[PDB]
Amino acid sequence: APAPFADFAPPVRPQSTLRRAITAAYRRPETECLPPLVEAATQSKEIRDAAASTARKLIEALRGKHSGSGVEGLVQEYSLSSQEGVALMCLAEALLRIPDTATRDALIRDKIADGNWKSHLSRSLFVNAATWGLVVTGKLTSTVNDRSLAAALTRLISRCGEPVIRRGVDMAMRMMGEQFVTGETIREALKRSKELEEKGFSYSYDMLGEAATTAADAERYYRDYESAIHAIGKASAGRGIYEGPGISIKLSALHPRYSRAQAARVMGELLPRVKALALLAKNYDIGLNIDAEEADRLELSLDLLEVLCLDGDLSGWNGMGFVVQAYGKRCPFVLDFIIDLARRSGRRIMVRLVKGAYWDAEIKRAQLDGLADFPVFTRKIHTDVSYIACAAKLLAATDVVFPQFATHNAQTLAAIYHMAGKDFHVGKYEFQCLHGMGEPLYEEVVGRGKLDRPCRIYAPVGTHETLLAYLVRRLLENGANSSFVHRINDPKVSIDELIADPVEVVRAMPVVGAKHDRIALPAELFGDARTNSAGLDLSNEETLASLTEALRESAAMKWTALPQLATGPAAGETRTVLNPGDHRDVVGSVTETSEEDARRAVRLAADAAPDWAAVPPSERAACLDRAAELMQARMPTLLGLIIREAGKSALNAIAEVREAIDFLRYYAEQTRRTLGPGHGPLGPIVCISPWNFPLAIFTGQIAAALVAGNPVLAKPAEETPLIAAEGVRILREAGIPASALQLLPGDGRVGAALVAAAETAGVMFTGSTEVARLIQAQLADRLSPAGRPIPLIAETGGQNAMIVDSSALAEQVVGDVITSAFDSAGQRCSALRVLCLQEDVADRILTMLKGALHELHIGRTDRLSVDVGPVITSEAKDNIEKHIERMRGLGRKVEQIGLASETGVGTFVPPTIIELEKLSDLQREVFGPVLHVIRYRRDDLDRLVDDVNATGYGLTFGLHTRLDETIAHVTSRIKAGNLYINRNIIGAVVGVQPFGGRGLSGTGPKAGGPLYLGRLVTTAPVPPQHSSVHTDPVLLDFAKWLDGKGARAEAEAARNAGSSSALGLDLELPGPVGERNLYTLHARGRILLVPATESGLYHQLAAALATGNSVAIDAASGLQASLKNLPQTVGLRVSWSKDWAADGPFAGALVEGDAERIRAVNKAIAALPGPLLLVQAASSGEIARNPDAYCLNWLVEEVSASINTAAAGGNASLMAIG
Amino acid sequence: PKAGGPLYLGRLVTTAPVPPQHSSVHTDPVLLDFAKWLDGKGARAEAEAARNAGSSSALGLDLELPGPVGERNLYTLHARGRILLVPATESGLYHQLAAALATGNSV
Amino acid sequence: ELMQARMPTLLGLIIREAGKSALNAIAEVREAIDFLRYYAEQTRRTLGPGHGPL
């Protein structure tokens, strides 16, 4: 039996002093980074003045020859609006997908110019309109208003005809064939390079590959690089690495799992591929540059650079190159490492200094991961100082490295030109620029008549498809508000402003190196409301080394879970708790609760209830906040327990502990916002939690119940009692009295005994729908001492779909699908179960998905390299496998990963893809790593949404599309609680995506949302921000009808309900950059009304209508004559039901009657098939006395929507942050 | 159509142009249900006309128009109300219904 | 342009023929100017050979 965590995340190599200095700087506070950069970048006043003069001269040259762009001239000639310009370029792009020229021109003349372009051109014309929007307007719009573009295209064609189409086609052909790329193929690019080479430029060809998703992708990128090296080397013809052309590669193109977590595969599989390419570059004596990518790949890439530079087979060749990003805090330390490596190896490493291309993505990633700080600067001027400081370091080392200063900023250029001094020879250093962007500047640099310094042009090479994939990121490099190229084209920016010295500006700031005011550190995402939980950086070697030791220590602990009654630990049946990934690994011991002790615990909770209710809400919230601090400090140990007890990966364990911390802090803050003396607790609450979020959901339910003033009986899932016991220990340490929080480990029998206990005043259940239904039936037997139903929150299963159309980027889709379906072995309630692919793209995406499936590592989760862990039990495994084999037996195509022999000691199911004919082929939630794939024709999208809704579930839902019309359609028609656009569908964040569904997926209110605490008190408070200015119009029609009938009191109550209803609430919740998180209140659906009196019926109708619902009224009430002559608008919402089971599904119920009538109705309601109904009951006297007899909080449905606004390739809002 | 508004000139030509800014991302849900019903009964040409009407309808357009400071000037497209349909043929009726439903109307 | 330049004369006629005040007569001429320029611009944005007159 392998020792737990003995091989968790060993580094590729022992970290040298120089490597450790890099890691130490990863997230160093910005105020600490700047002072040494300012000092290193300082130059003499004489040099600064000469640099400013050179920069001014270059800028004056740039602005003097600056003409109007081709697109601008086209927009001017045809008087195009911006949308028309964008639509025209999209049309031109589509026409260029027609390969034959004569065919294309015939389509233009005979069909496009004089008729409906729509009839002639499965794929929206406007798929890339966000890119063309950047080209035309300079502004990024993340999604495409395809209806506006279609209108604009019709308008411009009908107005201007063939001539404008011809001009647009010719413009797009030039831009996509000669500007965004040097050429479509390496041979074409090489042919077009001779002109500038003759002037003194050189070239580095960028083959535009990146982010391989499959082994086949990586092999394709490999053979593309290999073929390009041959062409470049043949053309170089012995010119060598400085005069002659070279190639640039991205490591992410060469392996589908290029990450620190997969470092062993990277060194074993990616490295030999780079070596083979480098050997070919050596033979031709050309440069081979490794481009720099995301910050979490920097240090990993250094391990490849080290091995290659020490490999004797590459000796004699100085063409190996490596990019370093000056926007990164580690940059100077990386340079120190590289310079030393160049000294040790004797290789004159070609070092390309760039600022960095991934800035907005780095901000978003650090915020999402809750990390200490950013790995990049947050003020643009800091990057500029960093660049100059790093140039100073490089210029001191030209004997051992070849510095390559890649920049389009004439101020940066001038500073370095003068820093380098008078002595120059080709080979000492060079500048670099981007093809079709930097030539105007560098035509003022290259040549004896200019500055006589060489410039290497980074030359993209590729087809239209290849160049468009990440063109947005490239356009933002030089097109943001802080970008030099954007500013040089802004007439409101003076030359004096452009030549401003960033070194001196930073030096004079009040606080040198202060963070940008408008970028929140991850801890501060929520501002004054609460402190964000902190994560851990699994790319940081210090973090991995520290976590390795903490994880090993956690595995040595004698974890136990006992029945912790108010009186102390109780005796019971004790058994071991085994690691699901290896049953030989005993994690701890659980003593389970007898049914007698469960009943005793409820009585003890009932006796203790007044004492806990008397703790003021602020103090109860303080306990939650203290518990959050304790869990944050204990996170490494908690991770180890979650990994081993629940079979979770470290990444998912981190998120689990963060969620528990977030629940504690969120419910604490919500309490401080709401709870007062009049919001009395229900009493003892039974909290029954599932195994799959054994700390987070466990903590969330208990924390909410406790902070609302209720004592808690906590019944964790039988599979995962140990982490639950630790959570209870932490809450008790934080100040929750033992009498207020009792842990009762055991199976469903303990849960059922707790539910059935007479003093149980409320039940919070998260688990399967089938078990919730049994709990619902048991609670229907009971009424509170006041004679009202026992509140049940039942958050249950999902049958979660993702719809993908032909506008989505397949690589993005596949990543989000692989994560959503197979993370946690599909054992998230939110997991993607059904992927729906538009027919035209289905085969391509399916091929990519299967390829990505086979790159997953399944095994025991005490290794960072494991992507998918075990399923929780052999019974779960058998249940999942029975489903897979049923599908296989029906002839459905089944793709499965092969499992390693090591999985035999645990319970594993390989990630599986099953292709279905229809969504209806899938009949039940299969809680495992099983993705079902269906295909749909675009015209059947609305029917498909019906099919998704038809399962009865409504938990999470994803949509991948760029098209606003599709977003609007799908999101308006789907009925699910958590919607996700252009991102994965998992990992809902407390207070950001309040989580919970409808139908068979939940009663609500949503956990992690603002209605939750109000369910746990007898009188719900008004949640923060909970109101709406909208009044339901059918409610208004009903109020007028009531007035016409003379029911004046009820009409007033109806108007009050119309105002008090929060239907129509529509909020954006604070969260990370690059995402829009929305929270809205909608009608629940059809509410079952069970009235007893005419006035009761009118009050019930008012409540239901005010919240946007339709109703089914019990025909057995005999009250049909009370609704004579209803307005048609109200009648449309009213049905009468004799057979309630036939007229569902309902989305809630309102009941009027005495206690025994309520009990009877509650039993009849519990017997209805399908979803658990949130039932509210009141007596006739209560309706007369209490305007809030029926609470409107429970008659609306919460919907959370999370939109990835960075999905097009950049963040429009951050383009304004410099 | 309104004088001083973007639909006006289109009434004075035999084929109306697409006015500036005249589009909507919203699709009438009853139109969508009608298109599916047409699909189910094999009325393929009519279902296509229905989907096309659903998309080209500007129902739900909601624009702020440029004007003076201190004022917000909004322009929105709503359903007309109830449209009288005087068909002659079944297909003609389906096309009339598609047009009316796509623009949010009853008939 | 002509109505703008001749607004004072147009005002006097509108005041005397239609009984309007000076402020309302100014607004009237401005509206005529705005209609002219608005329909001119709307034409430039929309009308092509397939939009035949009635």
Ligand SMILES: Cc1cc2nc3c(=O)[nH]c(=O)nc-3n(C[C@H](O)[C@H](O)[C@H](O)COP(=O)(O)OP(=O)(O)OC[C@H]3O[C@@H](n4cnc5c(N)ncnc54)[C@H](O)[C@@H]3O)c2cc1C
């Ligand atoms: C030949 C060449 C090779 C390149 N290779 C790579 C590569 O391998 N890896 C890579 O990441 N990119 C690469 N780039 C792109 C480069 O990193 C920059 O994104 C782009 O060139 C920046 O423009 P700049 O230095 O010309 O001018 P500028 O307009 O001076 O610089 C703009 C840069 O400032 C930075 N910045 C913007 N806002 C902020 C902010 N709020 N806080 C901190 N910094 C900010 C960004 O890096 C931005 O790109 C390359 C560029 C060229 C020309």
Ligand SMILES: NC(=O)c1ccc[n+]([C@@H]2O[C@H](COP(=O)([O-])OP(=O)(O)OC[C@H]3O[C@@H](n4cnc5c(N)ncnc54)[C@H](O)[C@@H]3O)[C@@H](O)[C@H]2O)c1
């Ligand atoms: N909507 C959500 O937020 C959410 C979150 C996580 C999991 N889930 C659902 O939870 C299911 C998986 O978790 P699970 O396997 O632990 O669910 P489960 O239904 O098997 O058990 C959940 C808890 O109910 C208890 N239980 C079983 N029978 C009981 C009974 N007759 N009376 C009282 N308690 C009883 C169990 O001991 C456990 O503590 C999945 O269906 C998943 O979709 C939903």
Ligand SMILES: O=C(O)[C@H]1CCCNC1
């Ligand atoms: O995966 C999700 O979206 C949530 C599932 C249950 C609660 N934790 C996160």
Ligand SMILES: [Mg+2]
């Ligand atoms: Mg179970």
